[PDB]
């Protein structure tokens, strides 16, 4: 049972200062120690509890391993080969004129993201619009950029790592007191880059949805959390960012930043349902990272 409160502010609650009982190393006396969980980590019961306890038994990510996408080259054994299409305009389906053969693919960093494709291969010449069925509004529309879009993301909270030992051996990593100002995580997109790249895609959308058609964009229809937000990892933490400001446009037939609100969560159930939970350990200091927007994942609704 978590007895929790707000965070020292002076407003909108976002975080929780939680206290609980805890098994020490010995199977005898308990421990009165405190953590500090985001609102998405916990849930009340009519006093709180962790948001996973009523679903999946949980496991804590080891603090030595890094979730940093490294290049991965896939290969095939003997008696097999892999073909690489090498033309500049290919919607991934149909015959390829300039086919070349390779043994192992190019470095493919497994970037687990949603909505915004990150650190991917850049397209060639015109931006690419790839779909399984353009007439069906039930298949996602993969997009690949030619010019990358610059995105910055800070976690400007100088947080603390408390190590409460639930021994013998094992030890949980919590969040101590916060050193500095109460801010939240934000991703920046330059206003000048996102306007030219948005119009570059819609001239490609006119090639498929009528010449003099009107193309509009809105945020997520709703449903689950992962679908609506820009889920991604960087520095270990898991961000969940609001893209109502990147998809609020209406195009007809013919200097600052765009900051995006980002939440945060420690306990996660990745790839829909696999791997149980995972409480990624907290991260000290101000986390900052730059990523490349090299594509988008769009859906269509069921004139314009």
């Amino acid at each position, epitope marked *: 049972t978590l007895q929790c409160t707000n965070v020292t502010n002076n407003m909108r609650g976002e975080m929780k200062n939680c206290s609980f009982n805890m098994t020490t190393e010995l199977r005898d006396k308990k421990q009165k120690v405190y953590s500090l969980f985001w609102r998405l980590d916990v849930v009340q019961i009519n006093e709180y509890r962790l948001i996973n306890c009523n679903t999946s038994a949980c496991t804590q990510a080891c603090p030595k391993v890094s979730f940093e996408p490294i290049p991965i080259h896939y290969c095939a054994p003997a008696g097999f080969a892999i073909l690489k299409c090498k033309d500049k305009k290919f919607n991934g389906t149909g015959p390829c004129p300039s086919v070349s053969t390779v043994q192992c693919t190019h470095g493919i960093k497994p970037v687990v993201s949603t909505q915004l494709l990150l650190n991917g291969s850049l397209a060639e010449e015109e931006v690419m619009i790839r779909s399984e069925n353009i007439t069906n509004n039930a298949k996602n529309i993969l997009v690949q950029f030619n010019t990358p879009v610059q995105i910055n993301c800070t976690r400007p909270m100088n947080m603390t790592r408390k190590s409460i030992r639930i021994g013998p051996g094992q030890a949980f990593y919590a969040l101590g007191d916060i050193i500095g*100002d109460i801010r939240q995580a934000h991703c920046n997109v330059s206003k000048a880059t996102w306007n030219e790249t948005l119009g570059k895609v819609v001239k490609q959308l006119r090639k498929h949805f009528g010449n003099n058609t009107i193309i509009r964009f809105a945020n997520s229809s709703g449903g689950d959390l992962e679908v609506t937000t820009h889920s991604f990892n960087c520095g270990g933490e898991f961000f969940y960012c609001n893209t109502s400001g990147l998809f609020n446009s209406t195009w007809i037939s013919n200097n600052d930043s765009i900051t995006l609100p980002c939440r945060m969560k420690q306990i996660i159930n990745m790839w829909q349902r696999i791997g149980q939970c995972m409480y990624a350990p907290p991260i000290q200091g101000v986390i900052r990272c730059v990523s490349n927007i090299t594509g988008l994942i769009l859906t269509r609704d069921g004139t314009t």
Partner: antibody, heavy 132, light 106 residues
Framework: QVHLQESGPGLVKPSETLSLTCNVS????????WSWIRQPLGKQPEWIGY???????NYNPSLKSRVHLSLDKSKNLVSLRLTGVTAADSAIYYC??????????????????????????WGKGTSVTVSS | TFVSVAPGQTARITCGEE??????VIWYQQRPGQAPSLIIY??????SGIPDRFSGSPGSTFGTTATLTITSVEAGDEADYYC????????????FGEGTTLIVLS
């Protein structure tokens, strides 16, 4: 030049209405903020509350249900009203101009800022003793 | 509290709790028998009429109090000093932090 002057009864019986007047000479009471501060003998200056035109006025959380300020735009003087006084409210009531500032520590757009006030031009002060 | 510094040296003045967020400390000078006057607002911004001998600790250090450094001490700066801790994690402070008194030796 800016000259401030507090005039008051000097003596008010317990559980009575203190009525203070701060005559202002050198500027108007509409373009500036205004603030009273009281200082017991030997204690630190305790803030009371700031007042300005356009309904922008706030009081100390400790003396809330008892104090009422006002700006006389026609007579160009600041008034104070402290209701239900005790021996605690005996102090020295100053009256000063107030300028404001905006401390920006975050990203501005996220309301990550707070307004701070500071008094620059004081008055001489009135002595208010409470005794029956 | 009190602070003693010889004529011509440097005085430093402690006031208020420790800093938990970014602050805007406001220092004041109360001469004996007079009204208090403004010395340093916005952590180290001096208004007109105050010399550059007075400097306050920057309101950007998390975990240090509000310090009022006073260089070239003179027999005139023998007066009281309060401050006004404006903190982002503290609600509005309406009582000034307890004062500090400067005493000029010799």
């Amino acid at each position: 030049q800016v000259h401030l002057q507090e005039s008051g009864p000097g003596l008010v019986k317990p559980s009575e209405t203190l009525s203070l007047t701060c005559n202002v000479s050198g500027t108007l009471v509409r373009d500036n903020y205004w603030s009273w501060i009281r200082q017991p003998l030997g204690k630190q200056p305790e803030w009371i509350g700031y007042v300005h035109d356009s309904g922008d006025t706030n009081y100390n959380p400790s003396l809330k249900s008892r104090v009422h300020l006002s700006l006389d735009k026609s007579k160009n003087l600041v008034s104070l009203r402290l209701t239900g006084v005790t021996a605690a409210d005996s102090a020295i009531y100053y009256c000063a101009t107030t300028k404001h500032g905006r401390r920006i520590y975050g990203v501005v757009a996220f309301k990550e800022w707070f307004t701070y006030f500071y008094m620059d031009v004081w008055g001489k002060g009135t002595s208010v003793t409470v005794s029956s | 509290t009190f602070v003693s510094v010889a004529p011509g040296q440097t005085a430093r003045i402690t006031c208020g709790e420790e800093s938990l967020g970014s602050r805007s400390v406001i220092w004041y000078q109360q001469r004996p028998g007079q009204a208090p006057s403004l010395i340093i607002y916005n952590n180290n911004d001096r208004p007109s009429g105050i010399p550059d001998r007075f400097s306050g600790s920057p309101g950007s250090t998390f975990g240090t109090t509000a310090t009022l450094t006073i260089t070239s001490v003179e027999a005139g700066d023998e007066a009281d000093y309060y401050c006004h801790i404006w903190d982002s994690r503290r609600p509005t402070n309406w009582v000034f932090g307890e004062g500090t008194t400067l005493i000029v030796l010799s």
